[PDB]
Amino acid sequence: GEAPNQALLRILKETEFKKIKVLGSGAFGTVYKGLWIPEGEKVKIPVAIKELREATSPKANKEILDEAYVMASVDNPHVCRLLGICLTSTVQLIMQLMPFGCLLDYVREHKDNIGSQYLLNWCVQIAKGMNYLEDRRLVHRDLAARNVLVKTPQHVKITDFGLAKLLGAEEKEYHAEGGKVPIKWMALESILHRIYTHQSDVWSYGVTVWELMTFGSKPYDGIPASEISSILEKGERLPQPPICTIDVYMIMVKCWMIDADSRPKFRELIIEFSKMARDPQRYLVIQGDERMHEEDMDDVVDADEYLIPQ
Ligand SMILES: */C=C/C(=O)Nc1cccc(Oc2nc(Nc3ccc(N4CCN(C)CC4)cc3OC)ncc2Cl)c1
């Protein structure tokens, strides 16, 4: 707002990195797991390279530069950062690898060892991430568990910016002509009016909590995307996760408030899960909670968040 944005965009020649394997593939493009080796510095930084499908229009292409723009410019522990971009005919964005994949996946793999302290911390981190975006006047528009990456099980980050939009000083809303959207994560207004606001994200934040508390369950499983709005109006809502006390579920519920301004706010959500964080057991009941807490896996390739700073 006042401060100059000295976020640095580095540009990398495609020969600076190599692609080992592919994690994700989509019409949108392909994202590879690979290594980045800046010349001279000898280090190998594990990264995810997202190679994007050829730009059909200038507009499509222009939005690719927007994504990178926000992503390079955003620094917070809990949001992903662009490491660098590469301007081949099909651009590639280089990002730090999240060695564990997307939380969505993680919870499904270890429900057995997932414990209360973890789930609440995750919430807090996700809420911190999101709050930061609110601070920067950005609307994510795609929060979901799939969209949360796991750096280390103890640490997570918000990941997807394909749909992120930055807001005008005079703007408290974003309106979208069209696209492809994940309905079951959307606030009724967005589905009804393609109106997006930080509060529409909060709704998502909640579907995201539900995902995590039900260890990977699908929102409105069996129900088709078509009527999500119907039932949403009629008052239906995702049920209480078996693990959840009313206190925690009650927060998921407020998120799904129809009135946008009756929904919690990220800064609040932070403090509240932060509070439940200290005495996790009291709020989330997990059975046996007391119980719980590339080419080569390592090759003189210690890197990433560490390379950038002291
Ligand atoms: C679960 C959501 C998802 O699919 N996430 C995802 C898929 C592909 C690519 C990226 O980008 C990305 N990924 C990572 N780390 C990462 C992501 C995904 C995985 N997977 C997902 C697919 N299963 C089959 C294999 C493991 C693994 C990852 O680390 C290896 N880091 C950064 C980025 Cl941008 C996300």
In short, whether 95's Cβ falls inside 6 Å of ligand 1 is yes
Instruction: Please report where in the chains the tokens 């797991």 appear, as a residue.
Output: 33
Instruction: Please report where in the chains the tokens 């008052």 appear, as a residue.
Output: 235
Give 278 Cα–ligand 1 centroid separation in angstroms. Answer: 30
Rounded-to-integer distance, Cα 273 and Cα 249, Å: 11
Rounded-to-integer distance, Cα 12 and Cα 9, Å: 10
Domain 98-301 has CATH 3.10.20.90: no
Instruction: Please report where in the chains the tokens 């394997």 appear, as a residue.
Output: 21
Catalytic residue among 66, 112, 135, 142: 142
Identity (one letter) of the amino acid at 97?
Answer: L
Identity (one letter) of the amino acid at 31?
Answer: V
Identity (one letter) of the amino acid at 58?
Answer: P
The yes-or-no answer on residue 160 being catalytic is no
Give 257 Cα–ligand 1 centroid separation in angstroms. Answer: 32
Which regions of the chain carry the CATH code 1.10.510.10? 98-301
CB 114, CB 289: distance < 8 Å: no
| Topology of domain 1-97, CATH | Phosphorylase Kinase; domain 1 (3.30.200)
Give 167 Cα–ligand 1 centroid separation in angstroms. Answer: 28
Residue in 50, 92, 102 to alter for ligand 1 test, most ligand atoms within 8 A of Cβ:
102
The number of beta carbons lying within 10 Å of the beta carbon of residue 142 is: 20
How determined?
X-ray
Which regions of the chain carry the CATH code 3.30.200.20? 1-97
Residue in 20, 21, 23, 103 to alter for ligand 1 test, most ligand atoms within 8 A of Cβ:
23
CB 33, CB 19: distance < 8 Å: yes
| Resolution at which this structure was determined, Å | 2.9
In short, whether 165's Cβ falls inside 6 Å of ligand 1 is no
First to last CA, the chain: 28
209 dihedral zone (left: phi>0; alpha: psi -120 to 50; beta):
alpha
Rounded-to-integer distance, Cα 58 and Cα 62, Å: 6
Rounded-to-integer distance, Cα 49 and Cα 35, Å: 9
Closest to 216 in 3D by CA, of 280, 290, 144, 159: 144
The number of beta carbons lying within 10 Å of the beta carbon of residue 123 is: 26
Both tokens assigned to 171:
């703007």
Instruction: Please report where in the chains the tokens 């390279």 appear, as a residue.
Output: 49
Both tokens assigned to 4:
């100059």
Rounded-to-integer distance, Cα 204 and Cα 63, Å: 23
The β-bridge partners of 148 are 158
